[PDB]
Design a protein around this ligand. Sequence first.
Ligand code: ZN
Ligand code: ZN
Ligand code: ZN
Ligand code: ZN
Ligand code: ZN
Ligand code: ZN
Length: 137
Amino acid sequence: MAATAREDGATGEERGQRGCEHYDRGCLLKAPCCDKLYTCRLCHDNNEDHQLDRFKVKEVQCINCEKIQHAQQTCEECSTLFGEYYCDICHLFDKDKKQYHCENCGICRIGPKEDFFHCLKCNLCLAMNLQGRHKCI
Ligand SMILES: [Zn+2]
Ligand SMILES: [Zn+2]
Ligand SMILES: [Zn+2]
Ligand SMILES: [Zn+2]
Ligand SMILES: [Zn+2]
Ligand SMILES: [Zn+2]
């Protein structure tokens, strides 16, 4: 029986629970460049000598169990919803904070459409106060 262990006690090994300041998600981007797990491309870039790109990543993990899977919205294993908003091309799964996948910009990013519109013949998305005030050539 357990009566010869002697190493009986507690561990104080602190670790990040879920999400990040950059993206509130229950997943980490698995970078195939080093098979490593980071919420953000810049949170990868800080630790690594090389860059993560949001088209190069293919897989993700679920921070709520650590199960490795392909880039999907839910952990089929423990039903972990990675975010409200999902998008495979941009490889972002996080909370919907009024964000929109613009067709001409070809991406989505945390951007309230009530404040942000696409300036036509410009390929950019600006604020309603800006009104598209550019040299749009
Ligand atoms: Zn981050
Ligand atoms: Zn890497
Ligand atoms: Zn899971
Ligand atoms: Zn997108
Ligand atoms: Zn746009
Ligand atoms: Zn413009």
